[PDB]
Amino acid sequence: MIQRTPKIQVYSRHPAENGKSNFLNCYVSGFHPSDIEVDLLKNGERIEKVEHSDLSFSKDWSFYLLYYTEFTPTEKDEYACRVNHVTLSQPKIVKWDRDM
Amino acid sequence: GSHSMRYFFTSVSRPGRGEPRFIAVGYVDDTQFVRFDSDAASQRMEPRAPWIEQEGPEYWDGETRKVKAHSQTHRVDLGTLRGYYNQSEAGSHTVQRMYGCDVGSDWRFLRGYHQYAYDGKDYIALKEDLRSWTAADMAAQTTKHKWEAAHVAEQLRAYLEGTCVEWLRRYLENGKETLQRTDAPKTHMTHHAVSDHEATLRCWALSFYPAEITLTWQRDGEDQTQDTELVETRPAGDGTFQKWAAVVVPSGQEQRYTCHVQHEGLPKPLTLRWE
Amino acid sequence: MLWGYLQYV
Fold first, then answer.
1. Per UniProt, where does a peptide antigen 1 bind (chain B)?
2. Is B275 among the domain residues?
3. Are residues B240 and B133 part of one domain?
4. What are phi and psi of A79, to 5 degrees?
5. B124 and B87 inside one domain
């Protein structure tokens, strides 16, 4: 059966400014089947209060989801998105670069 | 301009873990306005845009009644298709369905569509003429034949040309300030040194609506498609969209490169240069 | 507004 790997982008909703409140996004897309595990990490540990959009899909039937949480960027804190899917032999971690 | 309304339905079997998951979402252009999730507490169709919250209980009750009926047909469909493909009862399978309609810039019926997938590949689709069906597999011909005998395309055509576009225009009117808006991209560039002899120039488009955008780089006015890293347009979370395009620029060559932005929200396309 | 007249595969 068809299996497609998620593409992952991790980014903030607004341009990141230390001390100013924002939302950290992990956008997962291009994947099939729809079962996927997505976690937002703050200095390596799982963020608890994470929401996501309602499952929808693209023209080629592959799925997309936005995972997101309220955050206030600082100079020192590191954020990441960690994704597992059937296509990934291990969870894939993508670091937030306040520039991508 | 042109507009669309589209409903997206996903049903996923969960053998030994109860009923199948069913998720329905509705969109007008790039704006989600309704959802249903079978695993949620409410068991109702629910508003996801502020302009549809003004529809009364008659609307919500009727959309809930219909979405639950969609959920039940997809539940039977999972079983039917498993029998069609001689698959075991153990595995998890996926059905997806999408339908909806477009109007052109005169606001009249332009296009109507309906398609259905099993396990991420085309299963059956209504043709452009809205009278016949395209069936992928040998299994889908049974469905094609069933649907031809029950005159489904006739009934569907009536919806797509009638109800679908009438409600599209109603939503466009009611949500005028959200759906008949454009947000022009707010643009900037960043510059980051790869090494001593080259640097990455990134052209950004933020806070734009609708999602459709062209972002290109040129060098001496020649397009650099092959040499541009272009990311998928991505949701900001607030109903706007983001995109970037980057190129690797050798030392002293920043002035050769122009980033070009086209979006419906712009008075004329932008030509940006690092300088 | 959803279509109200669904059919089985």
1. 7, 73, 84, 143, 146, 159, 171
2. no
3. no
4. -120, 160
5. yes
